[PDB]
Design a binder for this molecule. Structure first.
Ligand SMILES: NS(=O)(=O)c1ccc(CNC(=O)c2cn[nH]c2-c2cc(Cl)c(O)cc2O)cc1
Length: 215
């Protein structure tokens, strides 16, 4: 029978919306740094659970291994980045991925409009948004201990949605699904992914595995 699901639609904070437009509608070379930002964001979450579990071992009930998986899908044109970090509560998602102002947004847009390399985005504290260099739509699935699993999604244009996720359960962590733009499909190629992880993500303190579908 028919199922019902609640959705909540949110507006991006004004300067965050402006940044997204700037990222989306301006040409940048060096778009590859998007993956560095995602792995760094995963690494941040992995540190958080690592140290939490030193206090309370019953925070690792939801899964012991701390790692990152990269999953390209050439048929769907998606690149999926999965971690077993601390995850996000509903309030974490809404606040941290779009509604609360970030202190670095205006500085970064100013820097960028003066010719700064897009690679600086991480240092301005808004690196998540680099996903929109290569992705037309981003879905973030997340599971925090003692909260339910949520899905966040945005195609930009100034809004995002959040809903309880009735899809495949994750133990704990965050899964980012990048629906890549048509001219950005090189980031589905095994060689290219290896190249950029090597160049930009070599000092990560957690194992990363690349899963490649049989050609
Ligand atoms: N939106 S933003 O300001 O650029 C941003 C958002 C999140 C982060 C760091 N990551 C986290 O805080 C976190 C906590 N639990 N899960 C995450 C997480 C978030 C993101 Cl965006 C991710 O791609 C992977 C994650 O594991 C850094 C910067």
């Amino acid at each position: 029978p028919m199922e019902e699901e609640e959705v909540e639609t949110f507006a991006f904070q004004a300067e965050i919306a402006q940044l997204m437009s700037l990222i989306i509608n301006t040409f940048y070379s060096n778009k590859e740094i998007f993956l560095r930002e995602l792995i760094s964001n995963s690494s941040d979450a992995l540190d958080k659970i690592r140290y939490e579990s030193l206090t309370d071992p019953s925070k690792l009930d939801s899964g012991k291994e701390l790692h990152i998986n990269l999953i390209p899908n050439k048929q769907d044109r998606t690149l999926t980045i999965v971690d077993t970090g601390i995850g996000m509560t509903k309030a974490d998602l809404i606040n941290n991925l779009g509604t609360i102002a970030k202190s670095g947004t205006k500085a970064f847009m100013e820097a960028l409009q003066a010719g700064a390399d897009i690679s600086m985005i991480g240092q301005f504290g808004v690196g998540f948004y680099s996903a929109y260099l290569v992705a037309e739509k981003v879905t973030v699935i997340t599971k925090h201990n003692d909260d339910e699993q949520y899905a966040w999604e945005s195609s930009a244009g100034g809004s995002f949605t959040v809903r309880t996720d009735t899809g495949e359960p994750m133990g704990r962590g965050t899964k980012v699904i990048l629906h890549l733009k048509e001219d950005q499909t090189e980031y589905l190629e095994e060689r290219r992914i290896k190249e950029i992880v090597k160049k930009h993500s070599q000092f990560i303190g957690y194992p990363i595995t690349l899963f490649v579908e049989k050609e």
